[PDB]
Amino acid sequence: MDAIKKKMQMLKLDKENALDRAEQAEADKKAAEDRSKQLEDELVSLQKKLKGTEDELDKYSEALKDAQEK
Amino acid sequence: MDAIKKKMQMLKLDKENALDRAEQAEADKKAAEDRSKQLEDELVSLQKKLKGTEDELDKYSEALKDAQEK
Amino acid sequence: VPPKIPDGERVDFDDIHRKRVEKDLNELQTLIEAHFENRKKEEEELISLKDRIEKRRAERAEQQRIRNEREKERQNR
Amino acid sequence: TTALVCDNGSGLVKAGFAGDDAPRAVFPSIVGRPRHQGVMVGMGQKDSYVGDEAQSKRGILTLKYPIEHGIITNWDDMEKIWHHTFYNELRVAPEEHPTLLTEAPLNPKANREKMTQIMFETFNVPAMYVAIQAVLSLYASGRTTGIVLDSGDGVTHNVPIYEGYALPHAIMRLDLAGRDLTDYLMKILTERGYSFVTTAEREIVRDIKEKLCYVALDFENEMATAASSSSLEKSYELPDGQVITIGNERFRCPETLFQPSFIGMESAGIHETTYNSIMKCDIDIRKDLYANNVLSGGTTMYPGIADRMQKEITALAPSTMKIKIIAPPERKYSVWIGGSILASLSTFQQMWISKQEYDEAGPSIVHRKCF
Amino acid sequence: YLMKILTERGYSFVTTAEREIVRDIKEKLCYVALDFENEMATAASSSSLEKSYELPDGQVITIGNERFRCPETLFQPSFIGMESAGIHETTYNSIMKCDIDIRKDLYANNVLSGGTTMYPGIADRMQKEITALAPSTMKIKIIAPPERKYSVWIGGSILASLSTFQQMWISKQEYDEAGPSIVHRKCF
Numbered sequence: 001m002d003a004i005k006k007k008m009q010m011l012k013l014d015k016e017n018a019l020d021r022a023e024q025a026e027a028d029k030k031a032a033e034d035r036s037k038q039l040e041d042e043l044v045s046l047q048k049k050l051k052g053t054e055d056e057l058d059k060y061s062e063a064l065k066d067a068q069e070k
Numbered sequence: 071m072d073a074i075k076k077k078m079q080m081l082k083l084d085k086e087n088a089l090d091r092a093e094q095a096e097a098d099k100k101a102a103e104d105r106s107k108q109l110e111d112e113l114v115s116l117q118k119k120l121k122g123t124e125d126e127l128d129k130y131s132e133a134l135k136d137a138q139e140k
Numbered sequence: 141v142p143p144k145i146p147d148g149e150r151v152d153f154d155d156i157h158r159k160r161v162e163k164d165l166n167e168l169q170t171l172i173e174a175h176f177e178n179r180k181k182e183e184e185e186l187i188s189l190k191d192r193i194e195k196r197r198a199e200r201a202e203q204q205r206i207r208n209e210r211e212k213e214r215q216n217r
Numbered sequence: 218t219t220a221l222v223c224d225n226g227s228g229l230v231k232a233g234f235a236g237d238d239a240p241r242a243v244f245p246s247i248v249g250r251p252r253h254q255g256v257m258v259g260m261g262q263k264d265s266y267v268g269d270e271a272q273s274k275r276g277i278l279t280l281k282y283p284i285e286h287g288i289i290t291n292w293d294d295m296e297k298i299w300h301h302t303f304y305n306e307l308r309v310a311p312e313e314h315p316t317l318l319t320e321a322p323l324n325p326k327a328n329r330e331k332m333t334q335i336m337f338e339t340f341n342v343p344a345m346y347v348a349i350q351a352v353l354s355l356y357a358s359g360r361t362t363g364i365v366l367d368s369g370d371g372v373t374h375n376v377p378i379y380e381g382y383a384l385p386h387a388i389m390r391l392d393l394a395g396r397d398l399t400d401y402l403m404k405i406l407t408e409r410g411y412s413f414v415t416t417a418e419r420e421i422v423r424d425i426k427e428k429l430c431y432v433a434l435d436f437e438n439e440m441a442t443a444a445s446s447s448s449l450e451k452s453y454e455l456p457d458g459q460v461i462t463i464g465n466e467r468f469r470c471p472e473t474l475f476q477p478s479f480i481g482m483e484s485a486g487i488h489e490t491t492y493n494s495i496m497k498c499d500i501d502i503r504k505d506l507y508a509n510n511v512l513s514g515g516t517t518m519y520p521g522i523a524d525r526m527q528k529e530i531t532a533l534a535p536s537t538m539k540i541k542i543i544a545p546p547e548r549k550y551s552v553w554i555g556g557s558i559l560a561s562l563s564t565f566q567q568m569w570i571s572k573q574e575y576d577e578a579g580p581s582i583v584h585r586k587c588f
Numbered sequence: 589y590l591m592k593i594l595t596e597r598g599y600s601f602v603t604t605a606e607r608e609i610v611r612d613i614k615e616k617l618c619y620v621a622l623d624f625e626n627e628m629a630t631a632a633s634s635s636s637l638e639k640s641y642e643l644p645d646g647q648v649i650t651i652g653n654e655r656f657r658c659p660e661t662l663f664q665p666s667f668i669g670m671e672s673a674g675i676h677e678t679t680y681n682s683i684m685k686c687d688i689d690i691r692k693d694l695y696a697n698n699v700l701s702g703g704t705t706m707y708p709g710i711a712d713r714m715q716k717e718i719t720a721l722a723p724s725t726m727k728i729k730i731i732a733p734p735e736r737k738y739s740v741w742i743g744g745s746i747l748a749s750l751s752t753f754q755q756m757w758i759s760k761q762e763y764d765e766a767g768p769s770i771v772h773r774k775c776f
């Protein structure tokens with residue numbers, strides 16, 4: 001018939017809109033996940049650097065007594 | 071008929087597939103964003119204590135140089 | 141020099157809703173109504189009228205047979 | 218009062234009042250004179266049947282289009298068509314209604330100059346405005362960005378627009394259009410035995426093209442498939458019977474759009490000229506044009522073009538960018554819808570070319586700031 | 589650009605074979621105006637600039653103000669949408685980038701070359717534009733030898749005849765030892 005064509009076009013329109021929304025959401029979710037992983041990476045590197053600095057402060061403190069005895 | 075009916079059913083099924091996938095993607099995006107925010111706030115405080123640690127190491131090395139050069 | 145369009149205010153891509161969503165439902169419903177009324181008016185009335193004309197045709201056939209037979213009976217000489 | 222959005226175009230004149238959604242009158246733009254003598258007298262014989270009348274009595278007429286490729290080559294016939302449109306199809310006096318004519322881009326200046334002269338001297342319209350057929354097509358879609366390929370019946374032109382700022386140096390124009398596709402179909406129909414020569418039979422060939430032809434998603438594979446089996450053989454009936462069968466000519470006719478090497482044209486197809494025009498634009502706006510490619514015009518209404526063009530562009534375009542082809546179902550009347558939208562805006566009411574300006578500055582006012 | 593603006597009059601050239609015809613038309617008819625605004629105003633009113641040309645099958649064409657509008661692009665690249673300035677300002681910018689001591693000599697010794705600088709009427713437009721840009725007191729001279737087209741090849745022929753140039757060549761042995769990247773070295 002004819003109204004079948006109109007209904008079919010309306011449903012194809014809805015499918016187009018839904019698939020577009022899904023694609024956009026998936027892309028943004030991917031991007032946010034990459035940002036989060038970069039943040040975690042820099043946090044762990046920050047812990048490494050802070051640990052090294054604390055180690056060298058401790059060694060310097062160990063050298064303090066040798067200083068005061070000298 | 072049979073073909074147009076089943077094609078319409080398939081179209082709606084695909085559209086709902088896209089919808090549910092988008093919903094899951096959006097929820098995951100929000101979870102990733104909250105995770106990133108918390109990592110950022112942890113990173114800020116760790117940076118602050120890092121600056122304090124480096125400053126105290128600076129004063130410690132200054133003291134070591136003071137004493138060992140006396 | 142190329143023409144310079146005076147600056148206005150708005151809008152665009154906001155009449156797509158008011159020209160699309162309207163016929164997205166009104167046109168479908170109206171065409172469904174038209175198909176329903178046309179089928180109802182047409183098909184059943186046509187089949188009933190054809191049956192009526194068929195009955196009249198059969199009666200004409202009977203009248204023709206009777207007249208042909210009586211005239212052949214008389215005229216047969 | 219409201220203005221008349223008249224889009225003469227090339228192939229089908231579409232007219233209607235501003236503020237509507239569909240044109241009031243759509244009729245072929247042909248002027249057909251009789252070629253025989255005629256013996257019966259008192260039959261109310263006219264000397265030139267124009268408009269839709271020439272499509273019903275085409276047997277005793279020599280149909281002759283007045284527009285070859287965008288430009289107008291038969292001024293008297295076009296004037297007759299305008300007269301018939303104004304006085305006989307809408308029955309409104311043009312003396313009290315502004316008009317919005319449409320023109321293909323990159324046409325010679327004489328066309329718009331003479332159009333304005335005729336509109337102001339003969340019909341005596343209050344004020345007329347000339348618009349390019351691609352900006353109107355972008356107006357109709359409700360968007361404000363994108364690259365529109367408005368493949369009419371006389372010319373195929375591709376215009377990119379970004380944020381409302383037209384790019385005059387990235388417009389690609391080709392003279393391959395619906396009329397050439399009809400001619401090529403009429404030429405390839407001679408391989409099966411069917412011979413059409415008379416100008417009236419070109420309308421039959423055009424009806425065949427509209428009702429039967431389609432664009433295959435892949436040309437070589439489909440042609441190899443159809444040359445062995447018989448799944449594509451479709452039958453069609455001429456206005457006197459004589460049912461004909463179409464096989465692999467079904468998709469060879471509209472493949473000329475993407476591969477113009479068939480009819481001897483040097484230029485590339487509509488799948489590659491769009492990408493080439495994209496490469497002409499700036500590097501910072503190519504993503505939006507990729508995501509907002511718009512189809513319009515009648516000749517892009519074949520079933521299966523929104524997939525072939527997308528596949529070809531995606532093959533050409535870089536892998537990362539997402540290619541989207543916006544093809545509304547009512548592409549054929551997109552230009553007039555855009556014109557009706559344009560005429561109903563309050564900001565546009567100051568851009569009409571008033572008669573006083575034409576009288577003071579001559580016919581060249583169209584080329585100046587008043588576009 | 590000339591092939592694009594010729595469609596404004598009625599003649600359409602599309603196929604690559606006709607680009608040579610348009611190139612010949614450009615070489616034979618185009619000329620660079622001394623001043624653009626007044627010339628454009630005159631060409632749109634008078635009829636002394638419209639010149640005719642014969643296509644290779646007959647069908648003579650008549651070009652009007654397109655004569656001096658196509659070469660005008662060199663001094664105003666906004667026609668094709670390019671961002672940079674014309675050749676009359678690129679030269680001055682390249683001069684001003686140089687040190688302050690050698691600007692006078694470059695002002696007084698500007699040299700032109702290349703085929704596309706063979707247009708009749710470019711040496712005076714360039715002089716006027718540079719005078720407009722450069723400081724007024726300095727003397728500006730534009731060298732335009734009659735043999736501009738072959739200037740590069742004449743220079744190459746002169747260079748190849750010098751005696752001191754005989755050791756600058758890239759010996760095949762050096763290429764065999766160092767590969768094609770030998771050209772980037774001090775051996776240019």
Ligand SMILES: Nc1ncnc2c1ncn2[C@@H]1O[C@H](COP(=O)(O)OP(=O)(O)O)[C@@H](O)[C@H]1O
Pocket residue numbers: 225226227228229230368369370371395396399423426427428514515516518519549
């Ligand atoms: N449904 C269709 N399928 C295929 N081709 C069509 C269809 N409708 C129109 N055409 C082609 O498009 C042409 C009409 O194009 P149109 O958009 O009216 O041109 P214009 O830009 O001059 O108005 C016709 O000549 C016909 O060849």
Ligand SMILES: [Mg+2]
Pocket residue numbers: 226227350367368369370514552
């Ligand atoms: Mg059109």
